[PDB]
Design an enzyme around this catalytic site. Structure first.
Site, PDB file in Angstrom:
ATOM      1  N   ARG B  80      53.896  57.457  51.064  1.00  0.00           N
ATOM      2  CA  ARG B  80      53.236  56.173  51.166  1.00  0.00           C
ATOM      3  C   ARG B  80      51.758  56.287  50.911  1.00  0.00           C
ATOM      4  NH1 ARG B  80      55.519  53.431  56.801  1.00  0.00           N
ATOM      5  NH2 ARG B  80      57.725  53.318  56.256  1.00  0.00           N
ATOM      6  N   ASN B 112      47.692  46.554  45.557  1.00  0.00           N
ATOM      7  CA  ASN B 112      48.054  46.897  46.928  1.00  0.00           C
ATOM      8  C   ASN B 112      47.921  48.400  47.203  1.00  0.00           C
ATOM      9  OD1 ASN B 112      48.592  44.972  48.885  1.00  0.00           O
ATOM     10  ND2 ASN B 112      50.695  44.587  48.199  1.00  0.00           N
ATOM     11  N   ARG B 141      52.935  30.851  53.908  1.00  0.00           N
ATOM     12  CA  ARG B 141      54.365  30.882  54.185  1.00  0.00           C
ATOM     13  C   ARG B 141      54.632  30.755  55.678  1.00  0.00           C
ATOM     14  NH1 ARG B 141      59.553  29.598  52.920  1.00  0.00           N
ATOM     15  NH2 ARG B 141      60.991  31.346  53.319  1.00  0.00           N
ATOM     16  N   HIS B 165      47.369  42.978  55.605  1.00  0.00           N
ATOM     17  CA  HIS B 165      48.477  42.400  54.853  1.00  0.00           C
ATOM     18  C   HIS B 165      49.611  43.411  54.946  1.00  0.00           C
ATOM     19  CE1 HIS B 165      50.755  41.233  51.055  1.00  0.00           C
ATOM     20  NE2 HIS B 165      51.036  40.348  51.995  1.00  0.00           N
ATOM     21  N   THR B 197      56.469  41.551  44.403  1.00  0.00           N
ATOM     22  CA  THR B 197      56.154  40.137  44.530  1.00  0.00           C
ATOM     23  C   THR B 197      55.276  39.721  43.358  1.00  0.00           C
ATOM     24  OG1 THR B 197      55.300  38.416  46.009  1.00  0.00           O
ATOM     25  CG2 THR B 197      54.073  40.486  45.896  1.00  0.00           C
TER      26      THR B 197
END
Lengths: 244, 276
Positions: B80, B112, B141, B165, B197
């Protein structure tokens, strides 16, 4: 959609509803000469709008199954949403409710007041008006700021929203454009937006009241739901007072 | 306005900026075939959009952009924080070439992870903080989901998400805890049903490029410095509500949260620090 009374309000409501492209059919409803001249001035700018049918007259029969009837009727539109605008609104919203028998009876209330009141506050803070949220309940001078959504500060901004309309009438004689825009309400009703506007309806049972503008959810069935807020003692105490 | 990266994100981003008539010129920026092919697809639909679209690789084409949206990202794999550095390595090539040609521009970081990659850009550009923004938690959302639980339009519901985020974000229930997770989980599920996304984050970048380009002085939860807030002391960037105009961020908000809420933003800050 029907709009009764072609005073400078009825036209700024009619001209604003037309710019919203809300009706397929707009009816203007006793001075025959005047009524036909306004209809034809609108009809001549049809290209610059989206409404192929604009027709005025004196015969209520033209108010047939007219989903919205802005009042600035039952017989021919027994199903219509009544939207009252005539100035002493909260009282005349009682009147209509009692004359029509309808369950679909709404008064402009403080939609416009809370509308500017918002603009002014955001104007001072330097924030887009859409991002500041805050309302004005009560009758359309006795308006009641719901500060809970410095005592003398916010009262001051409100003060300016009271003296405003008054001083407008001295200079002009009536508000025409200001209430045409806020009549925003036709939009949400027709389009079933289920948006929340401070509009005048029955509030008997709220705030201990036994005998005005409360936040209501508006849609194609009118007010589907009324809020029963638990506001501050003073705010609520000034609800009894504005009622009085 | 310049978009960097003509992958799905940038193209959804690009398509939103054109759909809002914010750009009178638009640049796009390694694969040529895609670049032109993407530039020609849009141009072939001009009559249905205002504009003057030009793609390429030479960053000279970006000269004097007012807003630069950065979408350049990289894909996870089986196996990650290496990712977090690959993109940093991508940003060591991107950001200098952006400032070299448009030093007074507004950097918008969509790639990101944003919060960190917004600190990277600021640190590489040496820009002032107001011209280095991150898509952050721009909440919409969250507001929508809640606004349908109540049967009301979402423009009459008000509430936001701050912090990372990511899973660390906090719902500021001072102005439902499930609906928060449903949002974060849905972001994760999108990235592995789909690969990424795009549509959503495109609509959002549109929202932000609009406020900025037009000076709406609008309030948006977006990634910036918050050192000095919430008992934080590391140059950490997080989504707080900021005021967006034609000069980037004009004012950062100093909110007053419940104690729980303030301990969670430190957690959210702590969690980003550990990788950063």
């Amino acid at each position: 959609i029907t709009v009764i009374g072609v005073g400078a309000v009825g036209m700024a409501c009619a001209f604003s509803i037309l710019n919203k492209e809300l009706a397929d059919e707009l009816v203007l409803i006793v001075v025959e000469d005047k009524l036909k001249g306004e209809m034809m001035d609108l009809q001549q700018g049809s290209l610059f709008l989206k409404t192929p049918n604009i027709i005025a007259g004196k015969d209520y029969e033209l108010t047939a199954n007219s989903k919205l009837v802005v009042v600035t009727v039952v017989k021919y539109s027994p199903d219509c949403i009544l939207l009252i605008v005539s100035n002493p609104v909260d009282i005349l919203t009682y009147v209509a409710w009692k004359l029509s028998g309808f369950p679909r009876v709404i008064g402009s209330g403080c939609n416009l007041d809370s509308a500017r009141f918002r603009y002014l506050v955001s104007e001072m803070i330097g924030i887009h008006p859409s991002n500041f949220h805050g309302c004005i309940l009560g009758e359309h001078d006795s308006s009641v700021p719901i500060l809970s959504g410095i005592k003398d500060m916010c009262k001051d901004v409100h003060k300016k929203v009271t003296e405003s309309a008054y001083e407008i009438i001295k200079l002009k004689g009536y508000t025409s454009w200001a209430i045409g825009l806020s009549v925003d309400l036709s939009c949400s009703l027709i389009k079933n937006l289920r948006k929340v506007h401070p509009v005048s309806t029955l509030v008997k049972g709220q705030f201990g009241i036994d005998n005005l503008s409360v936040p209501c959810v508006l849609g194609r069935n009118g007010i589907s739901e009324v809020f029963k807020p638990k506001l501050t003692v003073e705010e609520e105490q000034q609800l009894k007072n504005s009622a009085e």
